[PDB]
Amino acid sequence: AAPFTYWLNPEIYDAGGLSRRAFPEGFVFGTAASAYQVEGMAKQGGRGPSIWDAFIEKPGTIPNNATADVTVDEYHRYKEDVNIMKNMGFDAYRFSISWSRIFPNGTGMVNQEGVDYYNRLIDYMVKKGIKPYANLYHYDLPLALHEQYLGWLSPNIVEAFADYADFCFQTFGDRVKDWFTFNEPRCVAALGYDNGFHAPGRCSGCDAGGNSTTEPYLAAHHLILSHAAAVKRYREKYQLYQKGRIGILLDFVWYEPFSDSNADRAAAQRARDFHLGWFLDPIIHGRYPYSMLEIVKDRMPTFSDEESRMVKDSIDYVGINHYTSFYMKDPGPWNLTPTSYQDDWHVGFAYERNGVPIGAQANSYWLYIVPWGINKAVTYVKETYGNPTMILSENGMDQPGNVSITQGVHDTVRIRYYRNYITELKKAIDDGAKVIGYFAWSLLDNFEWRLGYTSRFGIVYVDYKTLKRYPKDSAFWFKNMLS
């Protein structure tokens, strides 16, 4: 790396008033990653294929036909990675367990080599004083279960997931005291089954097949049932002895009414219903959002009374993944013929008001930098869902992939992102929000799904040539803020 790499950025030492003492006693700071995005060894160590392994095969899917077969190779480099987390002052690490690394077929035969990996990773975190937060699912359905019955589209997936989860509880639950069933089930359902942007690539008229009017709702329904079934195992068999907690990780874009008109306000609420309420209303109230029931009608599955009881209160806390905000407008008169889940929202998007952008854009096409949105989103959950216990489980932003080491490490925009967002989060907590943790996405630059390696989200730069880690200025900003 060129000598400018080592210039000391003064922004590192501007914590903007933030410190641990500005947050609740015992408040957890961590970083979050996922198995597929960081591990490597996708086709090795006994790991069975997942839907993304098949999805990536088709040329054009990932920029420069890159894969996650190696990625940043945390499978071998976990000690270094945990050492960085500890040196930067983090309390915790939210990682995920690859279903197909534990069960290559999804069911039956345990891959012991996979189990051994997670045991190593967890034992080392513990040794180093890093709290393990284990997520069970991050986009990585075993391909065999998709081949057998179309995965999330079948009620068969429910007990299969619960069995896998049950296994993880008895195997890792002596050390792991903080569990999540799913990361972003809304994205699993919408990206996988509405427009086919993510594995398994299904939608109306997609090459893989599908039906954007029904499959998103079917997948989501089974995700909710699978979550509840997994939580039932934990609560009935493990929780009392292990003394841990279990939740779910939900993405939440803040939708701000474009104007104060009734129509624009109702549009913003509708977007929240279809985005967050889709999963949170069942978990907190045992039923789907009212607007969804009224718009989607017969295309939405119904819970039985038993199912409804199992789903309701099936969390000890909720994870809110939050990055961005948009303005939301009434789109005028609605189209009558169902086409897709996205179209079912019946909303208009806006990205500027009075010629002023809602915020600057990050590298990712969807990511607008709008710090006040984290405050609105957290406050909304507090006021709507009975002030639940919350973890702000993902927050971060990206640089373009094509940045060099020398410029990549000087990420002042990311420092300002964290300082501003965390400051707005602190405001929500000061006003009564029961937030107990905060997790930055992500420690390392990694495989960013359809963007491959063209998007860099890390507070630590990774040279993909050599797999060497270079802490960015933002990492040192955290180190100073947290000390």
Q: Which CATH class is domain 1-483?
A: alpha beta
d(CA 181, CA 223) in angstroms, rounded, equals 9
The residues that are catalytic are 184, 394
- 82 residue type, one letter: V
Other Cβ atoms less than 10 A from the Cβ of 342: the count is 13
d(CA 212, CA 340) in angstroms, rounded, equals 5
d(CA 179, CA 165) in angstroms, rounded, equals 10
Is the previous residue joined to 200 through a cis bond, with omega within 30 degrees of 0?
Answer: yes
**CB 143 within 8 Å of CB 53:** yes
- Residue 326 CB partners (closer than 8 Å, separation 6+): 253, 254, 255, 256, 349, 350, 351, 358, 368
**Measured CA distances, 58 to 166, 201, 401 (Å):** 34, 11, 22
The phi, psi pair for 249, rounded to 5°, reads -110, 115
Cα 225 → chain centroid: 19
**CB 369 within 8 Å of CB 361:** yes
- 129 residue type, one letter: G
Sign of CA dihedral 289, 306, 316, 32: negative
| Method for this entry | X-ray
**Measured CA distances, 266 to 255, 270, 297, 345 (Å):** 11, 6, 19, 11
Helices (H), 273-411: 278-285, 290-296, 305-311, 341-344, 372-384, 405-408
**Measured CA distances, 52 to 103, 161, 370 (Å):** 16, 18, 31
Side-chain half-sphere of 193: how many Cα atoms within 13 Å?
A: 25
d(CA 341, CA 299) in angstroms, rounded, equals 10
d(CA 398, CA 152) in angstroms, rounded, equals 30
Q: What is the DSSP string of 88-115?
A: TT--EEEEE--HHHH-TTSSSS--HHHH
What are the domain boundaries of the chain? 1-483
d(CA 150, CA 162) in angstroms, rounded, equals 17
d(CA 252, CA 184) in angstroms, rounded, equals 9
d(CA 312, CA 251) in angstroms, rounded, equals 19
For 74, the token pair is 């945390």
